[PDB]
Structure 1
Amino acid sequence: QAILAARRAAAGEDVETSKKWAAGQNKQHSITKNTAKLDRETEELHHDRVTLEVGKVIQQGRQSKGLTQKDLATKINEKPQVIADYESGRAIPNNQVLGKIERAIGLKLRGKDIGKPIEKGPRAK
């Protein structure tokens, strides 16, 4: 991005380092929500859940690879139950969970397009 280029150009002087949320921890499943607006939020009262179309995608996914719920659960490093729910359709969808499911499965259930014949291209383009 431009600012890093300028900071390189700022070899003479200036420049500040500020860290991040990050730098050291490990947490192993991601809240997709900001957790701050939800605190500020009182008006809206609904959570979208996941579309069952995605559940069909996961099911045909597993079948075409021929893995049971438990095997894909071991793969994505999460419980069998979260998989079973995500197929069932409740799933309270989490971006990183379905993202790892996307990395495992050939289809790209992640993203606006429901599916991709290959996720992000074969051997990644």
Structure 2
Amino acid sequence: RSQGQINAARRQGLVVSVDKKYGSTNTRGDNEGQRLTKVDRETDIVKPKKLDPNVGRAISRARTDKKMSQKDLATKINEKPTVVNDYEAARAIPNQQVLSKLERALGVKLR
């Protein structure tokens, strides 16, 4: 993955996995790019990572009741102030990049 073998496996061969990535370079990651096909080929309704039961309730207070506001909090994570609004109690589909920036900007280790 990351330097574990990609130099160790390059012992005088120099070509194993040298193909190009998907190619956005500013559009966000493909953490659900596998799930996007599954919801496309499955001809029924599937539930999209339903809710945020306690990572909403407990982590809204630890983040925002400390010093901050969501208008401030969404500004340092670079999202609209309604995105954090639907991460407060309920009513969101949680994606990884937004929830990662939510964690590393205010420390509370609940994923």
Corresponding residue number in structure 2 for 1:25: 25
Corresponding residue number in structure 1 for 2:9: 6
Question: 4+ residue stretches of structure 1 with deviation over 6 A?
Answer: none
Number of equivalenced pairs = 104
Residue 81 of structure 1 aligns to a residue in which SS? coil
The alpha-carbon distance between structure 1 residues 42 and 106, as it changes in their structure 2 partners (threshold 3 A), is same
Q: Percent identity?
A: 46
Alignment RMSD (CA, Å):
2.2
Corresponding residue number in structure 1 for 2:64: 62
The alpha-carbon distance between structure 1 residues 14 and 55, as it changes in their structure 2 partners (threshold 3 A), is closer
| Residues 31 and 94, structure 1, Cα contact 8 Å, conserved in 2 | no
Aligned amino acid, residue 65 of structure 2: Q
C-alpha distance in 1, partners of 2:64/2:6? 44
Task: Please say if 1:89 is aligned against 2:90.
Answer: yes
Gaps of 5+ in 1: 111-125
The alpha-carbon distance between structure 1 residues 67 and 31, as it changes in their structure 2 partners (threshold 3 A), is farther
Give the Å deviation of 1:92: 0.6
Q: Of Structure 1 and Structure 2, which has the larger fraction of its residues in helix?
A: 1
Gaps of 5+ in 2: none
Most deviating of 37-46 and 79-88: 37-46
C-alpha distance in 2, partners of 1:97/1:38? 21
Task: Please say if 1:105 is aligned against 2:110.
Answer: no
Higher RCO (C-alpha 8 Å, min separation 6) = 2
